[PDB]
Design an enzyme around this catalytic site. Structure first.
Site, PDB file in Angstrom:
ATOM      1  N   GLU A   1       5.736 -29.109 -15.116  1.00 22.16           N
ATOM      2  CA  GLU A   1       4.319 -29.820 -14.880  1.00 22.16           C
ATOM      3  C   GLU A   1       4.506 -30.559 -13.412  1.00 22.16           C
ATOM      4  OE1 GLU A   1       3.750 -33.476 -16.973  1.00 22.16           O
ATOM      5  OE2 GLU A   1       5.387 -33.064 -18.266  1.00 22.16           O
TER       6      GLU A   1
ATOM      7  N   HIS B   1      10.225 -31.828 -19.191  1.00 22.23           N
ATOM      8  CA  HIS B   1      11.084 -32.735 -19.953  1.00 22.23           C
ATOM      9  C   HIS B   1      11.020 -31.574 -21.422  1.00 22.23           C
ATOM     10  CE1 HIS B   1       7.159 -33.215 -22.186  1.00 22.23           C
ATOM     11  NE2 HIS B   1       6.600 -33.659 -21.019  1.00 22.23           N
TER      12      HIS B   1
ATOM     13  N   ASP C   1       1.620 -29.705 -24.961  1.00 20.19           N
ATOM     14  CA  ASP C   1       1.716 -30.560 -24.013  1.00 20.19           C
ATOM     15  C   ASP C   1       1.095 -29.827 -22.891  1.00 20.19           C
ATOM     16  OD1 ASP C   1       1.757 -32.661 -22.026  1.00 20.19           O
ATOM     17  OD2 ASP C   1       4.046 -32.861 -22.164  1.00 20.19           O
TER      18      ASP C   1
ATOM     19  N   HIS D   1      -0.756 -41.371 -16.455  1.00 23.91           N
ATOM     20  CA  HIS D   1      -1.146 -41.480 -17.856  1.00 23.91           C
ATOM     21  C   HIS D   1      -2.413 -42.313 -18.041  1.00 23.91           C
ATOM     22  CE1 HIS D   1       3.431 -40.948 -18.838  1.00 23.91           C
ATOM     23  NE2 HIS D   1       2.874 -39.826 -18.429  1.00 23.91           N
TER      24      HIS D   1
ATOM     25  N   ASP E   1      -5.775 -56.093 -41.830  1.00 25.60           N
ATOM     26  CA  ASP E   1      -5.256 -55.328 -42.954  1.00 25.60           C
ATOM     27  C   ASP E   1      -5.468 -53.813 -42.860  1.00 25.60           C
ATOM     28  OD1 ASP E   1      -8.033 -55.989 -43.322  1.00 25.60           O
ATOM     29  OD2 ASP E   1      -7.874 -55.549 -45.478  1.00 25.60           O
TER      30      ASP E   1
ATOM     31  N   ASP F   1      -4.638 -33.934 -19.661  1.00 25.39           N
ATOM     32  CA  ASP F   1      -3.384 -33.981 -20.110  1.00 25.39           C
ATOM     33  C   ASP F   1      -3.571 -34.088 -21.494  1.00 25.39           C
ATOM     34  OD1 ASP F   1      -0.788 -33.778 -20.801  1.00 25.39           O
ATOM     35  OD2 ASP F   1      -0.194 -34.796 -19.057  1.00 25.39           O
TER      36      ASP F   1
ATOM     37  N   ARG G   1      -2.345 -31.829 -11.479  1.00 28.12           N
ATOM     38  CA  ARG G   1      -1.146 -31.512 -12.219  1.00 28.12           C
ATOM     39  C   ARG G   1      -1.487 -30.303 -13.066  1.00 28.12           C
ATOM     40  NH1 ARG G   1      -0.096 -35.982 -14.251  1.00 28.12           N
ATOM     41  NH2 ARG G   1      -0.827 -35.986 -16.432  1.00 28.12           N
TER      42      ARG G   1
ATOM     43  N   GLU H   1       0.362 -27.967 -16.144  1.00 26.05           N
ATOM     44  CA  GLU H   1       1.534 -28.206 -16.973  1.00 26.05           C
ATOM     45  C   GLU H   1       1.517 -27.154 -18.126  1.00 26.05           C
ATOM     46  OE1 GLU H   1       1.540 -31.804 -19.074  1.00 26.05           O
ATOM     47  OE2 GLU H   1       3.815 -31.671 -19.710  1.00 26.05           O
TER      48      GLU H   1
ATOM     49  N   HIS I   1       8.191 -36.182 -25.497  1.00 25.27           N
ATOM     50  CA  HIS I   1       9.339 -36.390 -24.604  1.00 25.27           C
ATOM     51  C   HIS I   1      10.477 -36.310 -25.627  1.00 25.27           C
ATOM     52  CE1 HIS I   1       6.702 -38.919 -21.635  1.00 25.27           C
ATOM     53  NE2 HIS I   1       6.475 -37.625 -21.534  1.00 25.27           N
TER      54      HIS I   1
ATOM     55  N   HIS J   1       7.127 -37.860 -10.345  1.00 25.76           N
ATOM     56  CA  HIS J   1       7.692 -37.687 -11.682  1.00 25.76           C
ATOM     57  C   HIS J   1       8.599 -36.454 -11.747  1.00 25.76           C
ATOM     58  CE1 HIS J   1       3.715 -35.519 -12.107  1.00 25.76           C
ATOM     59  NE2 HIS J   1       4.480 -34.631 -12.715  1.00 25.76           N
TER      60      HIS J   1
ATOM     61  N   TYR K   1      -0.434 -35.946  -6.107  1.00 30.36           N
ATOM     62  CA  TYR K   1      -1.390 -37.027  -6.246  1.00 30.36           C
ATOM     63  C   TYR K   1      -1.544 -37.750  -4.928  1.00 30.36           C
ATOM     64  CZ  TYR K   1       0.616 -35.836 -10.741  1.00 30.36           C
ATOM     65  OH  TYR K   1       1.079 -35.133 -11.829  1.00 30.36           O
TER      66      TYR K   1
HETATM   67 MN   LIG Z   1       4.705 -33.374 -20.196  1.00 32.58          MN
HETATM   68 MN   LIG Z   2       1.407 -33.690 -20.291  1.00 34.49          MN
END
Ligand SMILES: [Mn+2]
Ligand SMILES: [Mn+2]
Ligand SMILES: [Mn+2]
Ligand SMILES: [Mn+2]
Ligand SMILES: [Mn+2]
Ligand SMILES: [Mn+2]
Ligand SMILES: [Mn+2]
Ligand SMILES: [Mn+2]
EC number: 3.4.11.9
Lengths: 439, 439, 439, 439
Positions: B382, B353, B270, B242, B38, B259, B403, B405, B360, B349, B386
């Site tokens: 970004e 974006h 972001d 991610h 609940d 990130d 990365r 970004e 996104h 990737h 890797y």
């Molecule tokens: Mn991004």
């Molecule tokens: Mn990001």
């Protein structure tokens, strides 16, 4: 402290023990949930599925098969190991490592559930399934239809379906020493967060600032998420039981009611502390606070095996009515007022509820929460008085919302308070705040 | 900075402007969502419903009716004011205050939606509805069936249904100056969180500790929630795009990829920054970091009206292949390697974006993200490299995930970087960390 | 003959007898069904609901409540008496007259089912429900959810759900003397229809003409509808087991296979007779017909308590293989051919199936239909040989489809043939046809 | 008479003509329907799907694609040719023979619909779909979701969905000369059935006996099924508009109202004739019959292009009120009674409805059925008077239900009555019955 693999196995054996021979229990994982568009909320495993596995992945089903009184085994359906899905979203346990890791006998890919489940239920007499919990789970289970219609293939469907929740929830109602240790740590983590909030609070800060302090404290001790949405209601907001906006700037002269608890190893901490924003209760604030504190203290002395939430509630109601009559908030004869539930406009919720994998934990309360308490039961104790800003009472009490809430565990001779490490006596709160206000 | 009532009204008028006469646009609120039993997750309004109302309540529907080319009006269905539901769960706008508050012409109780909606669609020619977004919304809209079958009552159903998302999302793709100010504040809030993380990071701390620091920083500036689940991947975890577990202790000698982005007034920040846990890049870490940084810097110089994500991606790919060949990670002719997309195992990737009410964000990219960029578009930049812990490359590069970004806005003559206030040059990162490490 | 109210009551008591104390059995009526737009097919009540009520109205639910071992009662939910709905669509039993008429203790309006059902299941331990039979029934039953979530109202849901079909279908498998009398009348009505068809058939008539003769004969005896869609396959159509097009003109020199049975008082008649369209079997037609007839006659001599469908099937297979080898249709050793199931391309269906409220009646067959036969069981006996028009066999046998099917009841010392009143010996068929062909 | 392949093609071209360029129209077949357990009702194709194909198989979808103003083509999804499914259930058209047979450009297996449909809708601007007609059709169409989410694969979904029914039904409202010939044959077949019923009726026969005579007559002329469930209401049953029980024995001295019509080549015949069971109207029966007959005759003289059902209804109402006042059934001033719709308790339905592929055919009636009639429209004309057995009227009129119903086609200068070949003047009915009663 935590719950190891061995305990998860014991719980599975305890369920199988209660199951009929020639049966299968199906326990499904929680589905992932969308926050917005393609982003999802942080995953929260189903409490019952967690209770038996300690496995935090979606798309998984635990199948406990009791062939007979001596023979039983477990099968786990879980996401297959996938290199590109893992590079993107994270590691998956997979099938090879599942048996040893979780302590199950076999592990099959979730992708094969519809081709394998009916084969596992074929010829069994009973299927234990929590129907109506998750739509996807029901679709999988109902697709039984293969067995029903497969007599030419010599398949037979179990004709009995039993909801395993009443039994599992009664299990969950009684904590093992290990679970109590986990809850004890959760209560301690939550108490440190509340102490921190009291020490950081200053007139002019926003309600959400205290929420930020609290969640940072939860986090540093390894409890990433709150067990419920944090409540920080100052002034009139304190009269809203589950006020979660936490958007108003905190006023000098107002009280602030903080309801917050962490989630540690799946278990809920559940603490409420109400204190003056400026570190000093006003006379009118102190007068209501005293009634709520006595209600809590008396309850803490009384809670033990043999009594019940209903019984202890009657004690709190008399304390409340007595104090409200003395302050002028209620008018009349105490016993007459008690008989007409005159306290209800000011105290409209229950005094306790169970505590465990869910903040409002599973388990039968008995009518009017009259079930006799026994050792191992964990519950909250959270009297409160909320005088509406427009209540027909002396002007100085309007807009005062106070609740003081601890988490306890019923022991052989009383109860152990898991959250007493954060002060609740007014002089102690003020003393704490006064020391913080000077640096 | 924020989006006022006037702007929400302008957006509604801009939609109505594009609508055919004799039509109605239906925009539904996000349903509340269960976390466990609940308890529900903190409410997140549907991005499109938010874009037109700035109203954060569930069980609400915005109805924009265009009678003809000059006549149009709005009707809002929203939860009725209820005293006991509000004492328990929070205040509700209700119907009386809705018109003035939101700027709508009328407000009806959500409880009456099925008795009123068909009456509002009666005799219209077109109904704009985002079919398949929410099941409850579809059930309400499909229940059109009343109109279709009500000819004896002189009712007629619109025979045309148009998905309003392509138009609304194209609107969302181009930010107003006010939206850019909000995103600018979100980028600034997110940059302070990342700076804080760099200054707090010490070998031995857990990945989730940095997440705790970041979320506390988001909170103090009024951005209660992250726009997406925070990623803190140290060592090998940095190769998981991610990675949200954030459960490992951070090792001396490893890099940590963070990130994270806040959600301020509905908009997403972001940012990704990768840095050494001990405040000092190793030679091998520095060599990969340089390739990713040049990719980012070159992209930041190039992004402008007239170019495209696809075009800028080709520039990044050449930079990457060049550096990977020079380090020995790739072998062969640069142009030949580029032609066979040899960078893909290390950069899998997209470079950008869109960014807005969703991390996104909505909006057509064109095939291969080739749509020509125009002023008002907000996007991320970004690049990342890797190297898998088992990649067939020189031993010293294995397990390195990097990365970097930033969030930018395309302007008349280039782009404005909204997140450059958090350092990204290695000497600057080390300098920042070195100063924090001494107190 | 028919099934009176008393027998319906006995059946209800027999179910209650097998039910656990503190339980409720739910039996739902069939929903009405659309034929086209707003026109519906003639109503057909669910067989199981009919078996317990003999009530032919939709929107009705039979609730059998077993409070304990001595106390039990029935509640019927059925359409309320409505003057305008009755003036338009027909009379309704209603609630006042239901108890006496059907023999139930109480009758409630179907419109109140959701407000009353949960109250009837409150506190029971078991609910017997045929899950997955009808979606509307499942929605009503699942809406249990009220009980599950109504603990504060002191409501409890039964934790066990048992499918009542296996028990009810085993009941249906054994006919009472009254049911056998009804089936005996159905077999007799169906036999008269088949005799009529044989006497009316003339080259040039269309297959559907015989269907028209058959349905007119069913009707005149009070069996309005066929128990299944009538099959009239002449020539090559006879090789299609359930050929229902019945669109071809019947050719001089072809055989016509008629599969048709009435539905009398809910029970199925099930007869197949194959005969020459011109009243005279050709040598090749007669040679295949003899094998199928011997298969039927031998089966009729053998069927009795103690044997099984599987056992009698082995006898038929040997008869078939023997005759097919003798005619040249099969080549090899009889025992070897039998061992490789060489008869299958010519006889691809089962020899029998149960017969009752459904043409393919409920009841467990045992693996490979090996269940030992007992008195009271009603079944069909319907060997057949179908030589495909392109089968690699002597040219003169191609396109010959023959099946000869009777309905029998297993008695204490054999079986009683319910459909022997329509001829099946070739000379008798020809004699019958020859007499009709002369007027 | 029938509708050939060429006409089905013309209808498809006429739809495509009205379709926008860059669009696709989807027309689904009716699903098969269960009668009981595993037996299904005789298949009835969806009227709209039939209108465009004349194809009687389930699991089929007609896809009309209009690439541009000059280019368009058709694709049919239909059951694949399967040898074992055909040996058991019947022949299937399959894919190879479909194009030539139906006149479509391509034919794909229905089993591949989900893999092919989205590819056919990719990049189109509009999809015409009759939403909410069939759940399975909606599931297939909604699964658009592939296109919406497939931008990375360069897929785009049509943003506009248009219900093709209003246009198709307006097409269906106007019959082609070929359709009128088919309806003319259906009216003639239905008239012969009604004549036969009048000639067979004798006191003591059961209502369903006349239904049996009628359905046998439909059948012999090639109309296997009724277009609606046959109504045979004698005595008081005649006051039930759609009395379909047909279970009572017909009484000497009672009237019997027969409502029955065949379905020939998909089209509905729709005839009602009420006559004395003993071949002789009583004075009271004759007095009500005269009012209903004049209503019908006057309507038949009036129906023509330029008028409307509403207009002709006013004429019938005056005729009815006039006669009811004269008989003593109504009391007062004719014009005053007409103004208060005093005829309603005795005539509670409409005078006409459209007739075609559905007995209650598609097509807009205009408010109160006021649409101006035009050549090509086919409709029924079915005044009726029903005096309830307990109506407060002269005793001798109670329990009299009379309706007299013909099917007409509006022509350039009036209407052509398609069912006048079955008598309706009382002396003609009696004369017909008297001749039959003597053999
Ligand atoms: Mn991004
Ligand atoms: Mn990001
Ligand atoms: Mn609390
Ligand atoms: Mn609590
Ligand atoms: Mn048969
Ligand atoms: Mn059979
Ligand atoms: Mn009619
Ligand atoms: Mn009609």
């Amino acid at each position: 402290s935590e719950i190891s693999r061995q305990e998860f196995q014991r719980r599975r054996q305890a369920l199988v023990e209660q199951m009929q021979p020639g049966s299968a229990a199906l326990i499904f994982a929680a589905p992932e949930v969308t926050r917005s568009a393609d982003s999802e909320y942080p995953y929260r495993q189903n409490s019952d599925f967690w209770y038996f596995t300690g496995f935090n992945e979606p798309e998984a089903v635990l199948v406990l098969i009791k062939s007979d009184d001596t023979h039983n085994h477990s099968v786990l359906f879980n996401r297959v190991r996938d290199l590109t899905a893992e590079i993107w979203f994270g590691r998956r346990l997979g099938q090879d490592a599942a048996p040893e890791k979780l302590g199950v006998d076999r592990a099959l890919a979730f992708s094969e559930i519809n081709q394998q489940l009916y084969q596992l239920l074929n010829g069994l007499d009973v299927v234990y399934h929590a129907q109506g919990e998750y739509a996807y789970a029901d679709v999988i289970v109902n697709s039984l239809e293969k067995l029903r219609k497969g007599s030419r293939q010599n398949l037979t469907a179990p004709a009995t379906m039993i909801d395993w929740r009443p039994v599992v929830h009664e299990m969950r109602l009684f904590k093992s020493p290990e679970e109590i240790a986990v809850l004890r740590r959760a209560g301690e983590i939550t108490a440190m967060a509340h102490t921190r909030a009291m020490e950081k609070c200053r007139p002019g800060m926003f309600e959400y600032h205290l929420e930020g302090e609290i969640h940072h404290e939860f986090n540093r001790h390894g409890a990433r998420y709150p067990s419920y949405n944090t409540i920080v209601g100052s002034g009139e907001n304190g009269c809203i039981l589950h006020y979660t906006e936490n958007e108003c700037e905190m006023r000098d002269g107002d009280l602030v009611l903080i309801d917050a608890g962490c989630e540690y190893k799946g278990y809920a901490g559940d603490i409420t502390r109400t204190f003056p924003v400026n570190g000093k209760f006003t006379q009118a604030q102190r007068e209501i606070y005293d009634i709520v504190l006595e209600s809590l203290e008396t309850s803490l002395r009384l809670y033990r095996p043999g009594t019940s939430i209903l019984e202890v509630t009657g004690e709190v109601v008399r304390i409340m009515v007595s104090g409200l009559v003395k302050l002028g908030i209620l008018k009349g004869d105490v016993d007459e007022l008690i008989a007409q539930n005159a306290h209800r406009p000011f105290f409209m919720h229950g005094l306790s509820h169970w505590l465990g994998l869910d903040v409002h934990d599973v388990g039968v309360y008995g009518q009017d929460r009259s079930r006799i308490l026994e050792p191992g039961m964990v519950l909250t104790v959270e009297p409160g008085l909320y005088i509406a800003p427009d209540a027909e009472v002396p002007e100085q009490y309007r807009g005062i919302g106070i609740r003081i809430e601890d988490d306890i565990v019923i022991t052989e001779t009383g109860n152990e308070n898991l959250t007493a490490s954060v002060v609740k006596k007014p002089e102690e709160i003020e003393a704490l705040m006064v020391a913080a206000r000077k640096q």
